[PDB]
Protein backbone atom coordinates (compact mmCIF):
# COMPACT_ATOMS: atom_id res chain seq x y z
CA UNK A 1 0.00 0.00 0.00
CA UNK A 2 3.04 2.36 -0.45
CA UNK A 3 2.92 5.70 -2.30
CA UNK A 4 5.85 6.52 -4.62
CA UNK A 5 7.70 9.77 -5.35
CA UNK A 6 8.31 9.67 -9.15
CA UNK A 7 11.41 11.94 -9.18
CA UNK A 8 13.13 10.35 -6.12
CA UNK A 9 15.56 8.02 -8.02
CA UNK A 10 16.62 10.85 -10.40
CA UNK A 11 17.09 13.26 -7.40
CA UNK A 12 19.27 10.65 -5.62
CA UNK A 13 21.41 10.17 -8.75
CA UNK A 14 21.78 13.98 -9.20
CA UNK A 15 23.09 14.24 -5.59
CA UNK A 16 25.44 11.28 -6.14
CA UNK A 17 26.85 13.11 -9.18
CA UNK A 18 27.23 16.30 -7.04
CA UNK A 19 29.21 14.26 -4.45
CA UNK A 20 31.43 12.93 -7.30
CA UNK A 21 32.05 16.50 -8.69
CA UNK A 22 33.02 17.71 -5.16
CA UNK A 23 35.09 14.51 -4.54
CA UNK A 24 33.04 13.79 -1.38
CA UNK A 25 33.15 10.19 -0.01
CA UNK A 26 34.76 8.83 -3.22
CA UNK A 27 36.56 5.60 -2.20
CA UNK A 28 38.28 4.44 -5.40
CA UNK A 29 40.43 5.71 -8.27
CA UNK A 30 39.97 3.95 -11.64
CA UNK A 31 43.19 4.14 -13.67
CA UNK A 32 42.77 4.00 -17.46
CA UNK A 33 46.25 4.30 -19.04
CA UNK A 34 47.55 7.83 -18.08
CA UNK A 35 44.18 9.00 -16.72
CA UNK A 36 42.56 8.72 -13.26
CA UNK A 37 38.88 8.83 -12.37
CA UNK A 38 37.60 9.09 -8.80
CA UNK A 39 34.26 7.41 -8.06
CA UNK A 40 32.08 5.72 -5.44
CA UNK A 41 32.41 1.90 -5.48
CA UNK A 42 28.64 1.53 -4.73
CA UNK A 43 27.67 3.51 -7.89
CA UNK A 44 30.23 1.62 -10.04
CA UNK A 45 28.80 -1.73 -8.83
CA UNK A 46 25.22 -0.57 -9.36
CA UNK A 47 26.00 0.26 -13.05
CA UNK A 48 28.56 -2.30 -14.18
CA UNK A 49 28.75 -6.11 -14.12
CA UNK A 50 32.57 -5.82 -14.10
CA UNK A 51 32.70 -3.51 -11.04
CA UNK A 52 29.95 -5.55 -9.33
CA UNK A 53 32.24 -8.65 -9.66
CA UNK A 54 35.41 -6.70 -8.63
CA UNK A 55 33.99 -5.06 -5.51
CA UNK A 56 32.18 -8.23 -4.23
CA UNK A 57 35.56 -9.97 -4.30
CA UNK A 58 36.79 -10.44 -0.68
CA UNK A 59 40.28 -8.92 -1.59
CA UNK A 60 39.53 -6.41 -4.38
CA UNK A 61 36.66 -4.87 -2.31
CA UNK A 62 39.37 -3.18 -0.14
CA UNK A 63 41.53 -1.71 -2.95
CA UNK A 64 41.66 2.09 -3.32
CA UNK A 65 43.06 1.84 -6.90
CA UNK A 66 41.75 -0.32 -9.79
CA UNK A 67 43.74 -0.52 -13.05
CA UNK A 68 41.73 -1.25 -16.18
CA UNK A 69 42.96 -3.26 -19.20
CA UNK A 70 45.46 -1.11 -21.25
CA UNK A 71 43.22 -1.47 -24.33
CA UNK A 72 40.51 0.61 -22.58
CA UNK A 73 40.15 4.10 -23.99
CA UNK A 74 40.10 6.88 -21.28
CA UNK A 75 37.54 9.02 -23.16
CA UNK A 76 35.23 5.99 -23.60
CA UNK A 77 35.55 5.33 -19.85
CA UNK A 78 34.90 9.01 -19.05
CA UNK A 79 31.69 8.97 -21.19
CA UNK A 80 30.49 5.76 -19.43
CA UNK A 81 31.34 7.09 -15.95
CA UNK A 82 29.32 10.27 -16.74
CA UNK A 83 26.46 7.99 -17.94
CA UNK A 84 26.59 6.00 -14.67
CA UNK A 85 26.10 9.20 -12.65
CA UNK A 86 23.56 10.97 -14.92
CA UNK A 87 21.63 8.47 -17.18
CA UNK A 88 22.98 10.60 -20.12
CA UNK A 89 25.21 9.03 -22.77
CA UNK A 90 27.33 11.33 -24.98
CA UNK A 91 27.26 8.97 -28.01
CA UNK A 92 28.94 10.44 -31.14
CA UNK A 93 30.21 9.11 -34.51
CA UNK A 94 33.78 9.79 -33.33
CA UNK A 95 33.48 7.91 -30.04
CA UNK A 96 30.87 5.13 -30.64
CA UNK A 97 33.41 2.34 -31.25
CA UNK A 98 35.37 3.21 -28.06
CA UNK A 99 32.13 3.59 -26.02
CA UNK A 100 30.80 0.18 -27.20
CA UNK A 101 34.15 -1.60 -26.50
CA UNK A 102 34.31 0.03 -23.02
CA UNK A 103 30.63 -0.86 -22.30
CA UNK A 104 31.30 -4.50 -23.32
CA UNK A 105 34.34 -4.65 -20.97
CA UNK A 106 32.42 -2.95 -18.14
CA UNK A 107 29.40 -5.26 -18.81
CA UNK A 108 26.89 -2.39 -19.28
CA UNK A 109 24.39 -4.28 -21.45
CA UNK A 110 21.91 -1.41 -22.17
CA UNK A 111 24.74 0.82 -23.46
CA UNK A 112 26.11 -2.09 -25.58
CA UNK A 113 22.53 -2.48 -27.01
CA UNK A 114 22.14 0.91 -28.19
CA UNK A 115 25.68 1.21 -29.56
CA UNK A 116 24.90 -1.95 -31.63
CA UNK A 117 21.62 -0.36 -32.90
CA UNK A 118 23.30 3.01 -33.75
CA UNK A 119 26.12 1.17 -35.65
CA UNK A 120 23.59 -1.08 -37.54
CA UNK A 121 21.68 2.06 -38.74
CA UNK A 122 24.87 3.61 -40.27
CA UNK A 123 25.80 0.45 -42.32
CA UNK B 1 23.40 15.98 -27.82
CA UNK B 2 23.25 13.10 -25.24
CA UNK B 3 20.73 10.24 -25.34
CA UNK B 4 19.16 9.18 -22.01
CA UNK B 5 18.23 5.76 -20.60
CA UNK B 6 14.86 6.35 -18.84
CA UNK B 7 15.15 3.48 -16.31
CA UNK B 8 18.84 4.09 -15.37
CA UNK B 9 18.25 6.10 -12.13
CA UNK B 10 15.66 3.55 -10.87
CA UNK B 11 18.04 0.61 -11.76
CA UNK B 12 20.89 2.33 -9.84
CA UNK B 13 18.65 2.83 -6.78
CA UNK B 14 17.46 -0.84 -6.94
CA UNK B 15 21.12 -1.99 -6.87
CA UNK B 16 21.92 0.41 -4.00
CA UNK B 17 19.03 -1.15 -2.05
CA UNK B 18 20.41 -4.66 -2.89
CA UNK B 19 23.83 -3.58 -1.50
CA UNK B 20 22.06 -2.34 1.68
CA UNK B 21 20.12 -5.67 2.10
CA UNK B 22 23.41 -7.65 1.71
CA UNK B 23 25.27 -5.15 4.00
CA UNK B 24 27.84 -4.52 1.22
CA UNK B 25 29.97 -1.32 1.50
CA UNK B 26 27.71 0.15 4.23
CA UNK B 27 29.88 2.67 6.14
CA UNK B 28 27.61 3.93 8.94
CA UNK B 29 25.21 2.70 11.62
CA UNK B 30 22.34 5.06 12.53
CA UNK B 31 21.26 4.49 16.13
CA UNK B 32 17.63 5.35 16.94
CA UNK B 33 17.02 4.54 20.64
CA UNK B 34 17.46 0.70 20.97
CA UNK B 35 17.57 0.11 17.19
CA UNK B 36 20.43 0.16 14.66
CA UNK B 37 20.25 0.75 10.91
CA UNK B 38 23.19 0.19 8.57
CA UNK B 39 23.36 2.43 5.49
CA UNK B 40 25.61 4.11 2.93
CA UNK B 41 26.54 7.71 3.89
CA UNK B 42 26.31 8.79 0.19
CA UNK B 43 22.64 7.65 -0.07
CA UNK B 44 21.75 9.24 3.30
CA UNK B 45 23.26 12.58 2.15
CA UNK B 46 21.54 12.37 -1.23
CA UNK B 47 18.11 12.02 0.51
CA UNK B 48 18.31 14.08 3.68
CA UNK B 49 19.29 17.68 4.47
CA UNK B 50 20.26 16.53 8.00
CA UNK B 51 22.64 13.77 6.79
CA UNK B 52 23.97 16.06 4.03
CA UNK B 53 24.97 18.57 6.79
CA UNK B 54 26.35 15.81 9.12
CA UNK B 55 28.51 14.03 6.55
CA UNK B 56 29.95 17.28 4.99
CA UNK B 57 31.19 18.19 8.47
CA UNK B 58 35.01 17.75 8.58
CA UNK B 59 34.75 15.65 11.87
CA UNK B 60 31.36 13.88 11.61
CA UNK B 61 32.18 12.71 8.02
CA UNK B 62 34.56 10.11 9.61
CA UNK B 63 32.18 8.68 12.25
CA UNK B 64 31.00 5.06 11.85
CA UNK B 65 28.08 5.58 14.30
CA UNK B 66 25.51 8.44 14.34
CA UNK B 67 23.05 8.72 17.24
CA UNK B 68 19.74 10.41 16.45
CA UNK B 69 17.71 12.56 18.88
CA UNK B 70 15.97 10.27 21.49
CA UNK B 71 12.56 11.65 20.41
CA UNK B 72 13.00 9.98 16.98
CA UNK B 73 10.79 6.95 16.49
CA UNK B 74 12.68 3.83 15.14
CA UNK B 75 9.75 2.68 12.96
CA UNK B 76 9.41 6.19 11.45
CA UNK B 77 13.15 6.12 10.70
CA UNK B 78 12.88 2.61 9.23
CA UNK B 79 10.03 3.73 6.89
CA UNK B 80 12.09 6.78 5.76
CA UNK B 81 15.26 4.73 5.26
CA UNK B 82 13.26 2.28 3.07
CA UNK B 83 11.89 5.31 1.15
CA UNK B 84 15.44 6.65 0.59
CA UNK B 85 16.47 3.35 -1.03
CA UNK B 86 13.26 2.60 -2.99
CA UNK B 87 11.20 5.82 -3.68
CA UNK B 88 8.32 3.97 -1.87
CA UNK B 89 6.80 5.41 1.30
CA UNK B 90 4.78 3.09 3.59
CA UNK B 91 2.46 5.88 4.85
CA UNK B 92 -0.36 4.61 7.14
CA UNK B 93 -2.87 6.17 9.60
CA UNK B 94 -0.96 4.50 12.46
CA UNK B 95 2.47 5.82 11.48
CA UNK B 96 1.84 9.18 9.69
CA UNK B 97 2.59 11.39 12.72
CA UNK B 98 5.90 9.57 13.43
CA UNK B 99 6.85 9.60 9.70
CA UNK B 100 6.16 13.37 9.39
CA UNK B 101 8.12 14.20 12.60
CA UNK B 102 11.05 12.02 11.41
CA UNK B 103 10.94 13.58 7.89
CA UNK B 104 11.00 17.09 9.45
CA UNK B 105 14.04 16.16 11.59
CA UNK B 106 15.79 14.48 8.63
CA UNK B 107 14.88 17.50 6.40
CA UNK B 108 13.11 15.40 3.71
CA UNK B 109 10.84 18.15 2.36
CA UNK B 110 8.85 16.07 -0.22
CA UNK B 111 7.89 13.50 2.46
CA UNK B 112 6.93 16.34 4.88
CA UNK B 113 4.73 17.77 2.04
CA UNK B 114 2.75 14.81 1.46
CA UNK B 115 2.35 13.94 5.15
CA UNK B 116 0.92 17.50 5.59
CA UNK B 117 -1.51 16.93 2.65
CA UNK B 118 -2.63 13.46 3.93
CA UNK B 119 -3.22 14.91 7.45
CA UNK B 120 -5.16 17.96 6.05
CA UNK B 121 -7.51 15.58 4.11
CA UNK B 122 -8.44 13.63 7.31
CA UNK B 123 -9.39 16.78 9.34
Amino acid sequence: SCIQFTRHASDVLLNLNRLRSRDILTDVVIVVSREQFRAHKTVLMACSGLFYSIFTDQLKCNLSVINLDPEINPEGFCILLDFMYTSRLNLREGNIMAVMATAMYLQMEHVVDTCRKFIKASE
Amino acid sequence: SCIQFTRHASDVLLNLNRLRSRDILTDVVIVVSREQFRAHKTVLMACSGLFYSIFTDQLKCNLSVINLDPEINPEGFCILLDFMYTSRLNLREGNIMAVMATAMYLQMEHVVDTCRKFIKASE
Partner: peptide, 4 residues
Protein backbone atom coordinates in the same frame (compact mmCIF):
# COMPACT_ATOMS: atom_id res chain seq x y z
CA UNK C 1 3.50 11.29 -5.53
CA UNK C 2 1.65 8.37 -7.24
CA UNK C 3 0.04 4.96 -6.57
CA UNK C 4 2.80 2.71 -8.04
Amino acid sequence: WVIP
